[PDB]
Design a protein around this ligand. Structure first.
Ligand SMILES: O=S(=O)(Nc1cccc2nsnc12)c1cc(Cl)sc1Cl
Length: 135
């Protein structure tokens, strides 16, 4: 029957981005990767099988895939090749994804708003907003 993340499931295409270069700078991404990754128009493919959520992000730059159980820490290699420890939880209907590495932390929030999936990425004082629509 219906569950946790049903409204996230599907295939989503990036339609807008704001301040992603600044977010990537704050994270520590170098110039060439910022330029190529910032040009990308990834799709995001979200699926659920039991307790396991899978999020794939695919673009001309890279294809990434994470599978996880809410509240259970895992290893992630990010699109920019960081080796991070991640934990994803659901907080009042928002997927909250925290990445830890090198004594640093960033949080990515994914939420459904109208027909969009809105992604907010925060690294200290810098927020990037990325908006997806159904493919
Ligand atoms: O928007 S993303 O979800 N993923 C991607 C951004 C750009 C190019 C890509 N190719 S594959 N996945 C990609 C993203 C990557 C971070 Cl690093 S931070 C954060 Cl949000």
């Amino acid at each position: 029957g219906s569950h946790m993340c049903d409204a996230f499931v599907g295939t989503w295409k990036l339609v807008s981005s704001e301040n992603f270069d600044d977010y990537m700078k704050e994270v520590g991404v170098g110039f060439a990767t910022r330029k190529v990754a910032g040009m990308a128009k990834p799709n995001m493919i979200i699926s659920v099988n039991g307790d396991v959520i899978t999020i794939k992000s695919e673009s001309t730059f890279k294809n990434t895939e994470i599978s996880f159980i809410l509240g259970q820490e895992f290893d992630e290699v990010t699109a920019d090749d960081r080796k991070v420890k991640s934990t994803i939880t659901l907080d009042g209907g928002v997927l909250v994804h925290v990445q830890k590495w090198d004594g640093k932390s960033t949080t990515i929030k994914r939420k459904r708003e109208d027909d969009k999936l809105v992604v907010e990425c925060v690294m200290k004082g810098v927020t990037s907003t990325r908006v997806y629509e159904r493919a």
